[PDB]
C-alpha cells in the first residue's frame, strides 16, 4: 500500500453531493512529501503529504449550490467535476433500508418512471467487512442520480425520503447508502460502543487475531462434510420432469398456495416438482408475457415448455419472471416448477399474486398443480463448527462501511434495523443508544441528528394477549428517545404478516421525512409523530393514559372502537380491554379486571387492527405500562 | 308378558340361516302353548315359568317365501321369509358408511340395484353396561332394492352382491357397527377377562350407584359465545351487511397456515360470485370438500347447508330459487374446538347447476367471529357407555347369538391404534368371545387390515398404524380366519376414504375361497412367511403368491427398508425373484430385519401378486 501519487478516498468522485454550511475536510494519499495543490472555486489550495502517506486540505464552508470542479495536481492530475453542496444523509440498516426500486417497481412503477432529480444522489456501498479495525476508504463506488439512469438502485425508503426533503427544501441530497441484509446492530457498531459487552469484547479481540481466525476456518472446514450429490429424478430420470415429452406417473394433486407440510407430505426436505397445464389463446401468443409466482420456499427453476424462464435461489425475493415473446405457444402449454427446499416448510406463499400477464390479459395460477418429489433430504447435524462469517462479527461492518467517512461531513443519519436482534430484544434497549453515541463520538459529531425505523408489524396474528419479542424490540426504539437528537417513525400499519419485506417503503421514507422536516429542517408546527404514551393513573377500575404527540386530537383510524389495548392487574395476566377517547387521553378498562394496574396497546408480533392515530394520520407507537 | 312376543329380528322379510337348525325363540306368558304354522306343518311348545319359549326347526334349503303363523292367546303372522346366508357385519365408522354417502361413486349402483333377495337388518346404536340384553331394538329386513338400498353399508353390499351373483342364494346382513367405537366395547365379558384393568372396569359399571356417582362428579366438577356474526345487530349472512375488518383466505386451507396462530373459534369466510343466467331457476349442489369443526352454509343470506363435525363429506343440494342472475354472496361459518379449523385440501369445492360448475377454490375474506379462551379441557366427564368394555357387545351382539348365521365380517381398529400393541391379544380374543357366545367353534370371520391413512414420509419411521396392520397380520395363525389387505385403498386427508366397493369385493374372494368352495381362486395378495439372512441379502419368502409377484406400477418394487441389530432402517433395494424377494442395501452390510410398508400412508407400496392382490406390510424383527 504504497501511494506513489496522489489516491483520493473513494467517495470523494465525481458528482459527488458535499455538505454544505460546514468547514469542509478534502483528504487523501500520496508520495512522500507530495505537493498537492487544489484548484477550486476561484482559488488554489496547496498541502505537502506528510510522511505516513496522507494529506488534508480544510476548506472553508460552502452554501448549498453548485456545479463545481476540483483539479488536484501533485505527481498526477486528479479532476473532479459536477460537484455540488447540500445535505448528506447517511441511510443504513438491514434488508429493508437495502430494499431497492428495482424489486418494487409494480408499486412505484409510476414514481420510478418519472424520476428527473439529477440534484438526488446516491453514493451505495458494495458489503464489506474487516475484522482488523476501522478501514480508511470505502469501496469503489459512484454518486448515481435520481433520473432515469440510476433511479432503479436507489434503496426506496431512501428514495422517498429525499424525494420529500428536496420538494420542500430545494437543496441538493445526496445519499450515502451504507446498509446489508441480514445484519446485527453489534456488527455496525465501532468497538468502543461494545466495550461493555464481555462477551462481545472477547470475540472482537479474537477477530483482530489472524491465527485464531484461521483455526476456527480449519476446524469448520475439517469437520465440513463433503458436497452432496443430487439425487433429483427429475435432473436424473432418463427423461427429465421438465421435457416437453415426459409423461407424469406418480404424480398428486397438489393447491398452490401452500405448503407441502400441509398437503400430506410430513418433514421433508428436498426437492418437490409441480406441474400444470393451462390453456393459452392467441392474444397472449408472440408478445412478452410476465409471472408473477408469489414466494417460493426456497429456491424454484420456472420451466414453459421445457425451456427455462426464470430461477430464483432463494426464498425471500418476490417472484417476477419476464417471458420473451415465443415461449407461449397457442393451446396447451405446459408449467413446470422446480422447488427446492433445504430447512423449514417448503412451497408456495399464501396471500401473494400467482398469474400468467400477457397482451392485458391474466391466468391465474392458484389452484390445481400435480407434485412428484424428486428427492427427500436425510436428516443431518447442522449445527457446526462453522467458520467465522465476517458480517456476522461486531463490528466489521462499522470497520469498513461506516468508518471511512467520519470525516465527510453529513447532516444526518436513517436508520432501519432490528430484524435480526428480536432474540436479544431486552438487550436492544442498551444497544440502540450506544450505537447512537457510538457513531456520534466517532464522526466527532455529538450534535449528529439521528432517526430511526420502529419494526413494522410482522407475522402471525394472534387472538388472546400475549408475549412478543418484536413488541419488545419496538419498545427499545420508543424509549431511546431519551437520546438527545433522535426520532422515530412508527411502522406498525405498513407491514405485512407474510413478508418480512413490506411493499410500502414510501410510507417509512415520507414518515422519516416529517421528522427530519421538523427538527433538522425548523418547521416548528408540524405535526411529524404519532401519540406517544406518556403517562397513566388508575382511577378505580379504569387507568386513564396520556399521551405526547396528540396533534389536533387522538382519532380511531376506522372510526370503529379502539383495538388491541389490553389491561391487567397485580398478576399480569392481560385480558382484551375496552378503551375509549375521552379528550385528549384514552380511558382503559375490562369488566374482568376489579383492580386494574397494567395496559398494552399493539403488544404482539401483527397486531390485528392497531386503530389508535392522530388526526394528522400518524400512527400511536405500541406500549404496554409495565416494566 | 301377557301376549306373545317376538325378538325384533324375527319380522316379517327376515332372511333365516340355510342349512342348519334352527331356533326360533321369544316370550309369552307363563305356561301358554304356541303353536307355529310353518312349511305345511305344525309345532308346538310350551311357555316356561320364566315367560321364554322356543321352537327347533329343521334345517332348510335356500329359497322362499314362507309364511310363519305363531298362535297363542293371539296370532302372530310373519311373511316373506327367505332362506339363504346371514352376515354379521360389524365394527366402527368405515363398516357404518352407507351407500347414501358414497353416492356420487356408486350413483349408478345405487340407482342399478335390483335385488330384492339382499336385505339388511341395520341395528341402531345401543349399549347396555349390566351385561348381555335379550333383544335388539326395532327395526327391519329392507331389500337392496330402491326403497332400501341406500341405507345399506357400502362395504357390506358390495360383499353381498358378489356373493349373490355368484352364489344366487338370499343374502342377508345383520349391520351391527358403530362409528368411533373401540374392540374392547365390541367383546364379551368373558374376552376381556384377563386384561385386569378392563375387568375391573366392567365390574364397575354393572354398579349403578358407582356409575352415577362418577357421573354426578362429573355434573359438578367440569363458555358463553360471543360470535360477532351471530351477536352484532347486522349478522354477517345478512345481504345488507358491509364487510370491514375482513382479510385474504384461500380455499383450501387451514388457517393455521394462513396468518391465524392458536385460534379456536368461529370464523367467517365470504365470497362473491357471479352466476350465468344458465344456471339459475334450476337445482344447484354444492360440494364444499370437508370442513374443521362444524359449518353453516349461507348463499344470499339463506341458509342452505350444515354439518356438526369435521367428518362429513359437505354436500348440500341447493333448491331452484336461492341463486339469482348476477352477483350472490357465499357466507360459510366455521366453527372449530380443537386441532387445525379450516377447508382441507385434496377435496372438491365446486357449485354445479345445468352441467355447469363454478369453482369455491381461491380466493375467499375473512373476520374473526370469536376465539376461544385456554380452558381445562380433561373434565371429568360422565362415562360415555360406547366406550365402555363390553357394552356394545351386550347391546348390539349378545341378543342375535341364538340366530343362524353363516359367518362374520369384522371393519375396525382405527380407535385402537393408541393401544396397537395390545390389539395383537384382543383381535384372536374378541373372534375367540364370539364364537363361544354364537356357540360356533367353527364361526368364519373375515377382517380388514386397517387402509393407509394420513402424511405420507420419505424416511423410514415407525408407525401406530403399522402395529394394528401387524396385529391384523398375525391373527391369520386363528383357524377360520381372513384378512383383506386395503393399504391401497386408504386417502391421506381422509380416515373415511370413499373407495367401499374394493373392500367389500376382496372380503368377498374370501368368502368364495373359504365359505363357497371355490377350489382355485387366489383370494390374497402375498403374505410374509419367512425370511433368510445370506451375506447382505436378506430372502423373503411369501405365501399367497398367485401366479407370480409382481409391481403394479412396473417399477422397482418400493417401501422396502432393511436394518442390522441396531435396528436403523434405510431405504432398500428390493428384486422379485421367483416367490422371493431379495432385499439389501450397500449401506448396511450385516442386515437383520426387513420392513416392507411400514408407515402410515406408504407412497408407493407396489408389490402385488398377478391377480392383483396387495401384498400386507410386514416387518421381520418383533
Ligand atoms: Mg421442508
Ligand atoms: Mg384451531
Known amino acids: 500500500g504504497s501511494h506513489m501519487q496522489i489516491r483520493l ?139 432515469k439512469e440510476g433511479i432503479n438502485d436507489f434503496s426506496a425508503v431512501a428514495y422517498f425520503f429525499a424525494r420529500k426533503i428536496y420538494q420542500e427544501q430545494k437543496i441538493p441530497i445526496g445519499i450515502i447508502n451504507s446498509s446489508v441484509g441480514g445484519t446485527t446492530i453489534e456488527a455496525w457498531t465501532g468497538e468502543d460502543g461494545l466495550k461493555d459487552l464481555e462477551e462481545v469484547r472477547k470475540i472482537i479481540e479474537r477477530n483482530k487475531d489472524s491465527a485464531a481466525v484461521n483455526k476456527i476456518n480449519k476446524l469448520a472446514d475439517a469437520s465440513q462434510s463433503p458436497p452432496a450429490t443430487s439425487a433429483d429424478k427429475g435432473m436424473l430420470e432418463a427423461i427429465k420432469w421438465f421435457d416437453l415429452q415426459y409423461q407424469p406417473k406418480g404424480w398428486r394433486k397438489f393447491y398452490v398456495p401452500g405448503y407441502w407440510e400441509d398437503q400430506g407430505m410430513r418433514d421433508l426436505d428436498g426437492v418437490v416438482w409441480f406441474r400444470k397445464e393451462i390453456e393459452i389463446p392467441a392474444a397472449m401468443v408472440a408478445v412478452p408475457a410476465f409471472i408473477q409466482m408469489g414466494r417460493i420456499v426456497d429456491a424454484d427453476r420456472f420451466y414453459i415448455n421445457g425451456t427455462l424462464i426464470g430461477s430464483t435461489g432463494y426464498q425471500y ?139 413494522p408489524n410482522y407475522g402471525d396474528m394472534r387472538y388472546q394477549p400475549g408475549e412478543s419479542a418484536w413488541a419488545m424490540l419496538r419498545e427499545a426504539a420508543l424509549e431511546t428517545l431519551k437520546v438527545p437528537n433522535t426520532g422515530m417513525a412508527v411502522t406498525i400499519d405498513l407491514g405485512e404478516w407474510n413478508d418480512i419485506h413490506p411493499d410500502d417503503k414510501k410510507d417509512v421514507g415520507e414518515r422519516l421525512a416529517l421528522i427530519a422536516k421538523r427538527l433538522s429542517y425548523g418547521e416548528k408546527n408540524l405535526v411529524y409523530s404519532g401519540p406517544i404514551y406518556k403517562s397513566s393513573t388508575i382511577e378505580g377500575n379504569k387507568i386513564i393514559v396520556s399521551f405526547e404527540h396528540i396533534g389536533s386530537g387522538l382519532k380511531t383510524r376506522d372510526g370503529e372502537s379502539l383495538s388491541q389495548f389490553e389491561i391487567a392487574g397485580a398478576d399480569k395476566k392481560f385480558v382484551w380491554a375496552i378503551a375509549e377517547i375521552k379528550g385528549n387521553q384514552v380511558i382503559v378498562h375490562s369488566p374482568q379486571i376489579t383492580k386494574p394496574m397494567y395496559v398494552r396497546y399493539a403488544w404482539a408480533d401483527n397486531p390485528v387492527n392497531p386503530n389508535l392515530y392522530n388526526i394528522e394520520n400518524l400512527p400511536a407507537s405500541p406500549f404496554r405500562t409495565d416494566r
Open 317 to 455: 425475493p418476490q417472484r417476477r419472471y419476464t417471458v420473451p415473446a415465443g415461449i407461449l405457444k397457442p393451446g396447451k402449454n405446459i408449467l413446470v416448477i422446480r422447488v427446492e427446499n433445504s430447512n423449514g416448510k417448503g412451497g408456495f406463499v399464501p396471500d401473494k399474486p400467482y398469474s400468467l400477464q400477457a397482451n392485458q390479459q391474466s391466468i391465474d395460477l392458484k389452484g390445481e398443480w400435480q407434485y412428484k418429489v424428486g428427492e427427500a433430504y436425510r436428516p443431518a447435524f447442522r449445527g457446526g463448527p462453522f467458520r467465522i462469517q465476517e458480517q456476522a462479527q461486531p463490528t466489521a461492518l462499522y470497520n469498513a462501511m461506516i468508518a471511512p467517512v467520519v470525516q465527510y461531513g453529513i447532516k444526518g443519519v436513517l436508520w432501519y434495523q432490528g430484524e435480526s436482534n428480536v432474540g436479544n430484544a431486552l438487550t436492544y434497549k442498551k444497544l440502540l443508544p450506544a450505537l447512537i453515541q457510538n457513531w456520534r463520538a466517532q464522526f466527532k459529531r455529538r450534535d449528529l441528528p439521528f432517526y430511526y425505523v420502529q419494526l
Open 9 to 147: 478516498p473513494h467517495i470523494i468522485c465525481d458528482s459527488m453531493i458535499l455538505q454544505r454550511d460546514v468547514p469542509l475536510k478534502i483528504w487523501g494519499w500520496a508520495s512522500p512529501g507530495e505537493q498537492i495543490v487544489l484548484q477550486f472555486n476561484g482559488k488554489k489550495w496547496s498541502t505537502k503529504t506528510g510522511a505516513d502517506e496522507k494529506w488534508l486540505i480544510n476548506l472553508p464552508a460552502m452554501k448549498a449550490g453548485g456545479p463545481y470542479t476540483m483539479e488536484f495536481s501533485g505527481k498526477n492530475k486528479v479532476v473532479l467535476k459536477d460537484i455540488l453542496f447540500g445535505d448528506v444523509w447517511l441511510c443504513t440498516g438491514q434488508s429493508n433500508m437495502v430494499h431497492q426500486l428495482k424489486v418494487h417497481n409494480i408499486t412505484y412503477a409510476q414514481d420510478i418512471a418519472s424520476a428527473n432529480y439529477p440534484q438526488i444522489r446516491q453514493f451505495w456501498v458494495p458489503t464489506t467487512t474487516n475484522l482488523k479495525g476501522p478501514s480508511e476508504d470505502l469501496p469503489k463506488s459512484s454518486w448515481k442520480p435520481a433520473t
